[PDB]
Amino acid sequence: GQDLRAFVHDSPEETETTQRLTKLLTNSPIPTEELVNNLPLFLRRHQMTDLLSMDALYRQVLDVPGVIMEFGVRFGRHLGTFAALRGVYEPYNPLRRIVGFDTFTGFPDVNDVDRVGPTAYQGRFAVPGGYPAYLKEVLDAHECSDFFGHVTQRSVLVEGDVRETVPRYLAENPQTVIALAYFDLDLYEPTKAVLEAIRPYLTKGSIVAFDELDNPKWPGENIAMRKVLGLDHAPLRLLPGRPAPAYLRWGD
Amino acid sequence: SDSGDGQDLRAFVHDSPEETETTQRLTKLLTNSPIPTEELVNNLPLFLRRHQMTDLLSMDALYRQVLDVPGVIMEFGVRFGRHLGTFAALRGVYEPYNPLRRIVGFDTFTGFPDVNDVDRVGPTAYQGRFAVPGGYPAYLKEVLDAHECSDFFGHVTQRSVLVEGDVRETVPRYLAENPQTVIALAYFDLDLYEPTKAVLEAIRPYLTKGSIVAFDELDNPKWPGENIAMRKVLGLDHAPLRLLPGRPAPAYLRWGD
Amino acid sequence: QDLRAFVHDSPEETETTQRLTKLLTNSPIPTEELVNNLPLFLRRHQMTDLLSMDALYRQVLDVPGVIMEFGVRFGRHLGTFAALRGVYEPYNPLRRIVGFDTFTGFPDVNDVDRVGPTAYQGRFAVPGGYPAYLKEVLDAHECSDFFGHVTQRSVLVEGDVRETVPRYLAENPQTVIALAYFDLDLYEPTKAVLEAIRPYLTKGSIVAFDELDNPKWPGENIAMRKVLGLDHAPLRLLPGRPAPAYLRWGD
Amino acid sequence: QDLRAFVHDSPEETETTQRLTKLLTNSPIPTEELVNNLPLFLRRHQMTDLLSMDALYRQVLDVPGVIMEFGVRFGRHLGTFAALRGVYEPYNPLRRIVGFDTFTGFPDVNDVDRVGPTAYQGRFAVPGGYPAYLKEVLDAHECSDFFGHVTQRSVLVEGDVRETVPRYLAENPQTVIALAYFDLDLYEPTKAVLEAIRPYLTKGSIVAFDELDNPKWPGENIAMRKVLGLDHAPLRLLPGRPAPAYLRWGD
Amino acid sequence: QDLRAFVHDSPEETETTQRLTKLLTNSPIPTEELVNNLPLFLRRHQMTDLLSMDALYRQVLDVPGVIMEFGVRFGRHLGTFAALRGVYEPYNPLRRIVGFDTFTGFPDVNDVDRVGPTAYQGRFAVPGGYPAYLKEVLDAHECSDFFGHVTQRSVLVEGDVRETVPRYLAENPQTVIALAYFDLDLYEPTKAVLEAIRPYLTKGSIVAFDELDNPKWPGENIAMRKVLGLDHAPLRLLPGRPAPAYLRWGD
Amino acid sequence: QDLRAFVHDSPEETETTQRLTKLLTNSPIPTEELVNNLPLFLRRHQMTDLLSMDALYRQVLDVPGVIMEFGVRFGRHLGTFAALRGVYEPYNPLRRIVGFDTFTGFPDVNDVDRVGPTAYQGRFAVPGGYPAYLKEVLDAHECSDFFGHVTQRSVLVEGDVRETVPRYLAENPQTVIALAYFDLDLYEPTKAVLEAIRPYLTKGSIVAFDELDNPKWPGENIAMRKVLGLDHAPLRLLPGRPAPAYLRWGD
Amino acid sequence: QDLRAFVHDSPEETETTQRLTKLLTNSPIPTEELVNNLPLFLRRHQMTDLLSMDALYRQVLDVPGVIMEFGVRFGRHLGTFAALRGVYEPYNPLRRIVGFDTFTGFPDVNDVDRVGPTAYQGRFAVPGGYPAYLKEVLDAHECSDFFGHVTQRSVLVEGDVRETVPRYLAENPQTVIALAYFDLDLYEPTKAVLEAIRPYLTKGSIVAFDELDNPKWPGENIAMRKVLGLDHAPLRLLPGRPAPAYLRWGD
Ligand SMILES: Nc1ncnc2c1ncn2[C@@H]1O[C@H](CSCC[C@H](N)C(=O)O)[C@@H](O)[C@H]1O
Ligand SMILES: Nc1ncnc2c1ncn2[C@@H]1O[C@H](CSCC[C@H](N)C(=O)O)[C@@H](O)[C@H]1O
Ligand SMILES: Nc1ncnc2c1ncn2[C@@H]1O[C@H](CSCC[C@H](N)C(=O)O)[C@@H](O)[C@H]1O
Ligand SMILES: Nc1ncnc2c1ncn2[C@@H]1O[C@H](CSCC[C@H](N)C(=O)O)[C@@H](O)[C@H]1O
Ligand SMILES: Nc1ncnc2c1ncn2[C@@H]1O[C@H](CSCC[C@H](N)C(=O)O)[C@@H](O)[C@H]1O
Ligand SMILES: Nc1ncnc2c1ncn2[C@@H]1O[C@H](CSCC[C@H](N)C(=O)O)[C@@H](O)[C@H]1O
Ligand SMILES: Nc1ncnc2c1ncn2[C@@H]1O[C@H](CSCC[C@H](N)C(=O)O)[C@@H](O)[C@H]1O
Ligand SMILES: N[C@@H](CCC(=O)O)C(=O)O
Ligand SMILES: N[C@@H](CCC(=O)O)C(=O)O
Ligand SMILES: N[C@@H](CCC(=O)O)C(=O)O
Ligand SMILES: N[C@@H](CCC(=O)O)C(=O)O
Ligand SMILES: N[C@@H](CCC(=O)O)C(=O)O
Ligand SMILES: N[C@@H](CCC(=O)O)C(=O)O
Ligand SMILES: N[C@@H](CCC(=O)O)C(=O)O
Ligand code: NA
Ligand code: NA
Numbered sequence A: 001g002q003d004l005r006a007f008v009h010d011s012p013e014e015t016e017t018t019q020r021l022t023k024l025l026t027n028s029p030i031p032t033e034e035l036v037n038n039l040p041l042f043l044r045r046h047q048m049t050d051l052l053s054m055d056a057l058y059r060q061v062l063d064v065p066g067v068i069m070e071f072g073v074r075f076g077r078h079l080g081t082f083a084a085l086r087g088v089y090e091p092y093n094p095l096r097r098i099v100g101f102d103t104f105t106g107f108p109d110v111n112d113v114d115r116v117g118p119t120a121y122q123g124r125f126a127v128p129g130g131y132p133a134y135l136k137e138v139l140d141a142h143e144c145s146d147f148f149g150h151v152t153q154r155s156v157l158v159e160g161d162v163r164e165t166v167p168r169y170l171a172e173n174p175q176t177v178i179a180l181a182y183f184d185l186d187l188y189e190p191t192k193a194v195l196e197a198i199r200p201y202l203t204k205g206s207i208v209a210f211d212e213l214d215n216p217k218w219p220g221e222n223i224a225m226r227k228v229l230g231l232d233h234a235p236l237r238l239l240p241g242r243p244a245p246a247y248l249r250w251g252d
Numbered sequence B: 001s002d003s004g005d006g007q008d009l010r011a012f013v014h015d016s017p018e019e020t021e022t023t024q025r026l027t028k029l030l031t032n033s034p035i036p037t038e039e040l041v042n043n044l045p046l047f048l049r050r051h052q053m054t055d056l057l058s059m060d061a062l063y064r065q066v067l068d069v070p071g072v073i074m075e076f077g078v079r080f081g082r083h084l085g086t087f088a089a090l091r092g093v094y095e096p097y098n099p100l101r102r103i104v105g106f107d108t109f110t111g112f113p114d115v116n117d118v119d120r121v122g123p124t125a126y127q128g129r130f131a132v133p134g135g136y137p138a139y140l141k142e143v144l145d146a147h148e149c150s151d152f153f154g155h156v157t158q159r160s161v162l163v164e165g166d167v168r169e170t171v172p173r174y175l176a177e178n179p180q181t182v183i184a185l186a187y188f189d190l191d192l193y194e195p196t197k198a199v200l201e202a203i204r205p206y207l208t209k210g211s212i213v214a215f216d217e218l219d220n221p222k223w224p225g226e227n228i229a230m231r232k233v234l235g236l237d238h239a240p241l242r243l244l245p246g247r248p249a250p251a252y253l254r255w256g257d
Numbered sequence C, D, E, F, G: 001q002d003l004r005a006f007v008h009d010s011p012e013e014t015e016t017t018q019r020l021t022k023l024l025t026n027s028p029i030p031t032e033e034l035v036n037n038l039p040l041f042l043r044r045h046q047m048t049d050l051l052s053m054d055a056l057y058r059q060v061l062d063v064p065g066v067i068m069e070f071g072v073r074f075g076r077h078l079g080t081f082a083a084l085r086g087v088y089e090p091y092n093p094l095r096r097i098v099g100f101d102t103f104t105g106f107p108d109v110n111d112v113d114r115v116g117p118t119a120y121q122g123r124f125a126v127p128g129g130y131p132a133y134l135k136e137v138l139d140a141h142e143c144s145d146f147f148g149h150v151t152q153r154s155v156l157v158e159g160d161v162r163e164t165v166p167r168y169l170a171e172n173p174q175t176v177i178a179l180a181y182f183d184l185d186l187y188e189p190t191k192a193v194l195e196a197i198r199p200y201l202t203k204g205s206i207v208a209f210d211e212l213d214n215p216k217w218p219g220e221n222i223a224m225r226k227v228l229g230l231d232h233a234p235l236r237l238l239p240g241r242p243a244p245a246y247l248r249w250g251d
């Protein structure tokens, strides 16, 4: 928009914390082999909040069959979270697949309704070339100590435009029930297409969550929700104190 | 020549002589206080009488009911801003980390712009009633900005927005300009039938199940417009209307219940 | 010592307070409408205090007896209770609000209270003749109470609590204390008052402290440890608020 | 037809009633203390009615709107509601109590109402000028209400409800109905008033009937079955009491 | 002494009471229908009393034993209990109601009772022969009880409770006390009766006080503090009502 | 066909039943004490029936209307209901118990009822003049009811329910049905009665079936599937008991 | 001495009882169907007893141990417990039912038991050879129990409980008592048995009294007050029922 200060942005202090913690992580006297035993030293409030919210969503579907999907993965923050939480809560559930969809090359197009702020452009949020192999190596590293680590395709990264890949994935996987659907695409067109595609695979109790439903910078999820279902189709909720995610329990 | 019996004005809610005395006494005690100037804002409950305290506690009760609902807080009918002040402070109490909880206040700031015959029950239903002074919205924006400058997210602007003009135009316009909008709490305090009806129709696509819709004068004989509006748009049994016990207003419903 | 290690206002909190002061005293709101729009000037920190007093009062609506504040200053909490009593208890003329203070600031301090630079005789003094003004304010709320014809529903007791609280209790053998709010900061009067009020509490009475765990004012904690022990009852916070700390007698 | 198959007083109920009437009119209690000792004369059957009106009113304390009674007679329930409103709602001047009656007894009956020997025009008539006396009684309660300066908080509407209820509603478009108490006995006015009040109920409003399943007075049942159906909402009793039967609108 | 600091009727309370007295004694309601319309004359303050007695009784419906009132005067509470016993306990002939009074007003007072100007020998006296009338009233209720054939289910015990309560208990070793209602006002007989009744309470018995925290009558408080302590059990109000204060024995 | 696939008494259940019959009819208990010791002769199977009837009755104590049994035989359940009504509802003279039967056994059967060897006309016939005796038993219970002076609180309707249930409803337009107990066994009369009673049920009324899922008597099931569907409401058991199966109307 | 102050049958209760006795003994029900229709003859007062025994038994379904009744007479409650054990505990062969009595009536009385005219030696005597018949009745129930092959699951112990209860316990050191039902009426044996059973109760065991607060039989109360105190545990009623009074051990 004109006044960029009306969009959510980091305070100078949030920026300082982030930069100091980056410096302390990369220049730490902690022995290299102990870094992964002390990561909360570097995990600041904003990111801790994200982790606790993913944990709250996952706990709500421990009694719901099916898979976890994220639309919009970037570097995989949420997928790493879900892989560890699946360890915590579901050692004996080899059917709880985690599926992450992304181009991995950033926004592949935008609609005029997404062009509110200056970051709505093709390629925004691109990750490095060959990143999906790295992210799959990370997920494989968590899986090798899972009780069901011998079962493969428990994590799947689907590369390309969700308008094509989500319907294709579903056609190839007619066993699918979706327990948790996490929408983090920002943009109107793919959100709408994916909401339409996933509907037959939800049960009553499935959770559908949105990372930017009510953000002025990214009105696409709301415009999509209003077109496909209506904002009062189901009860949208926050976890108190956190502006996102917004989430609904299908059928409520 | 013969005359009919007119309306008994005592049938409308009005201040008792004692309520008037309390109000006038506290006004004098505030304006002529021995408390040091800089401490007045640390002792305002000295001057906050039962009737106004009750309003504060009711706003707090409505806000607490939407702490787990996404979206914004809208007040239709702001006057000097009593409720917006209240919401700004409560948003600090409950939601330091929620920069999306916008507070949007709509008013002409020049009083009622017209009235309908159905609003013409008591003696204050006329154009301009409730006008606040020229330049008032700038002052109210200074007040809201003063609260915001100590908010955790005080660096994010447009978290309190005053929208000036007739809600029949400005509410549809605001919504068209803000397609991200979800409405968590919609506080109706316009009194009059026509703008109430128009705004109820406009806000519907932006409510979720669990959004609260509240009315300041729903069942008040002096201001039947909110009721007439609701009976036209939704029906009084569309959702369960509730009171906070012991308080004649607000009446509020939880959308979808 | 590092004064920064004591709780103090951020520059932004100071800015908000000063701007709201300026906007209240220079307002275009017509004079007779100011008391209809006070929340415009009631910032987060003070709103929180009001919500906490309301939470404490709501916990004793089913407990007999009176409300006492030890340490009144300008009367912020007494004004709050007077209005809340209107909201919740139109028909209870026995719910007396009793505020104790010298009204001339701390009358002495103990060495255990001298942690920060504001622990000195006379700190928090209010202007000469202030109690009459505070009583006029309380009388202004009472004149529209349902039981406004009953006097001594608010009582200001002037002097050192070491003498005045035992004297009040001896003069009022009907007393049950429903809510006892400790905001004296200092060790010695806190200890004396806790000892004095004990026989007038019931199970369910609330005892609250405004500075129990504050490094600047360790007197309430030193007093509680001497008289009862910190685990005599369950001390609690209202979540998100460092004070008050409060306990339900007998739990 | 056996009249013994209809509800009627046992010889013991009649003896209690007649004895209490004598003890009340010939009491040694000083005249100015009679109204401080009325439960002396309030027998189980009337006490039950009082407790039931209290239970219905408590269920709508969080529902906006007014209390209506269709079929007032001497005003037993109106006096009950006026006192309870004082107990529960000192600060609610919008809780109007509206009582509708011809005050001259049944104005007509339908053939379906003619089951027992008391279904005739004029049954339950009260004396000429009675409404002004009942209004004096309600005004006497109101002059000590917190909102006693607001008039028309108790309204007696005289005439046939088939005309007066629609007229009242037309003149009062602010109306929400929190509690609607049907005590007309007869089919036709019950049907007409049920139809009239529907747009003014909310989910959670209470609709109650005084004789819904009484063999002597099937008109409320016949009306309910025609307008709504008996399974439109859940009809309930207060356990142990044959009447009222009541439903929560929308359940 | 400021008599205005004691609870007293507002001019409007006095007006309501006097108007309702006039309207009851000059009523166009047919004489035989007065006892079917008593709520017309039952104002807020007295309705509140009735609802409180109902609340206390409801709490002992699962507790064995009898109901006792110490301090009956004209029998307001006994009338209420007799009707409620019919509503709740048709099949319980062991639920005796026992009322104790001199029926000649306070028989003595102690210095601690002499706070206000009504603490004198003979205050609250009722007329000569009043107990026989109150017994006739209670008998009138009982003649339509399911267990109306069992006598001595309502007992009036005349004399000073210091002698009569220990004597009643010695003559009735089957006694369990379910509800003990203290309304004597005075210190000495409250203390004596509290001491006497203790072996007959069970956990769950209710002990209630009519003036526990009233400045005019500190004797119940002084007595409680001597016999049990105010924190022996949790004293409670019914919210919004300054009395009774009651505790559940053993809590 | 294998008759052992139908429910039938074990040799031990037969021995219990025959022993207790002998012990009842040759008892050294004095004749006038037999009715004070009937549980001596009340075996597990029959005790279970009694407890289930009590569970169903307790579910409708807050629902208006009457109790109907379709299929009475000697009146086991009507006796049970008459006594329970005394236990729970002394003050409810509107809680009529209505029992329908030919009292001459099954009046016809349908091919779908002919699964076992007892589906024949006249099965379950009771002696000539039996309804007069059953009426004398019910009147014996009723003469110690609180409302024993009100007649027709127990009604025996003789004839084929296809004709008698619609006729009873037409003659009783006040009817609400709180509990409907189906024990006809046969398809056609169950279907006919389910259709007839529907306009007289409220949400919360209980509809119970004595043989819903028994292979010997599929007629209630066939009827339910025709009229409502088995998933119209939630059918339930009392855990541990194969019958009755019951639903709460509207759930 | 007014015998009317003791609980006694109304003329209507006597008429019910006498009618049902005649109807039982002159019944047109076939002899082999009498035990399938006993609720016909089971009036409200006895139905209540049955429901109360059921409520007590349900409270100990999660408590180990045996059921004991002190004071059996003809065995009303033992027959009830035998049937209930079948309903709830097919798979529990350790739930012994033990009934103690002289079976020749009261063997002596104490002066404290001599309040009414039935406190005499031999009151409640049952016929010579009665215990052998009661054992036949209990064995008839047991021969269709799932654990009917295990003997001694119901035991009749003949003699004075002062000797037989301590002897039984000494002989049965495995005993836990889940439910102890005191129905001896008399002071001395009640006290002796309360003393004896104490080491065999667990927290949650139920101790119940049939006449704890009955003026005619103060012995259970006197014994309680001597051995434990009436506030040792919380005594309760089943609401609406004067007896039994019961406590949960340890509460
Ligand atoms: N049509 C489309 N198909 C596939 N990915 C898309 C898309 N539109 C947007 N995206 C992806 O949406 C992502 C927002 S990805 C999200 C951030 C991430 N969940 C985190 O927690 O850090 C971008 O990586 C973008 O490439
Ligand atoms: N059509 C319309 N457009 C905008 N404002 C309107 C309107 N109709 C009524 N109003 C406004 O509704 C307000 C009613 S008074 C508002 C009171 C305020 N909420 C308080 O708490 O003190 C007036 O200021 C009036 O100007
Ligand atoms: N011994 C004593 N006797 C009486 N007052 C005392 C005291 N020691 C401390 N105080 C009082 O305790 C007060 C602390 S400041 C009280 C703040 C006030 N409750 C508010 O909410 O703003 C001072 O006014 C001080 O004079
Ligand atoms: N069509 C109609 N219009 C107005 N009143 C009617 C009516 N039909 C019946 N009524 C009134 O219904 C009343 C029934 S008696 C009401 C009893 C009263 N509620 C009490 O508690 O004592 C009569 O007074 C009768 O006049
Ligand atoms: N020592 C004593 N013995 C007996 N009665 C006493 C007493 N001391 C006080 N009383 C009685 O206590 C009573 C107080 S007034 C009782 C009010 C009554 N319960 C009501 O509800 O209206 C007086 O009647 C007085 O005579
Ligand atoms: N069409 C019909 N009309 C009337 N009664 C019928 C009927 N069809 C079956 N019945 C009756 O249904 C009864 C089934 S036996 C009922 C058993 C009884 N309720 C008990 O608890 O012991 C028979 O008496 C039979 O005559
Ligand atoms: N010391 C003692 N020893 C044994 N039995 C005693 C006793 N004192 C009293 N009893 C018995 O207590 C019994 C009281 S009557 C018991 C009634 C029985 N429970 C019923 O439900 O009908 C008498 O049979 C009497 O003999
Ligand atoms: N949805 C992402 C990115 C938002 C953005 O960059 O605007 C987040 O919450 O951090
Ligand atoms: N709704 C505003 C104004 C009412 C009016 O002026 O009538 C209030 O409650 O104070
Ligand atoms: N207790 C007071 C004063 C604290 C101080 O000055 O140290 C407060 O909370 O503001
Ligand atoms: N409905 C009124 C009157 C009934 C009648 O007279 O029949 C009552 O319950 O008393
Ligand atoms: N306790 C009695 C008497 C009070 C008095 O007279 O002082 C009451 O509440 O009315
Ligand atoms: N329904 C009856 C009869 C069963 C039958 O005869 O088959 C019962 O449960 O005993
Ligand atoms: N306790 C036995 C006998 C009572 C008696 O005979 O007094 C009963 O409840 O019937
Ligand atoms: Na976000
Ligand atoms: Na209002």
Ligand code: NA
Pocket: C210, C211, C243
């Ligand atoms: Na503090």
Ligand code: NA
Pocket: D210, D211, D243
């Ligand atoms: Na009725």
Ligand code: NA
Pocket: E210, E211, E243
């Ligand atoms: Na009192």
Ligand code: NA
Pocket: F210, F211, F243
């Ligand atoms: Na069956």
Ligand code: NA
Pocket: G210, G211, G243
């Ligand atoms: Na008994």
